[PDB]
């Protein structure tokens, strides 16, 4: 779970 959210969140502006 915690890992999940530190790998995802460096791409988080991606979409954008």
Same mark, same amino acid.
């Given at each position: 779970? /915690? /890992? !999940? !959210? ?7 502006? !991606?979409?954008?």
């Amino acid at each position: 779970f /915690a /890992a !999940a !959210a530190g790998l995802x969140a460096p791409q988080x502006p !991606a979409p954008f």
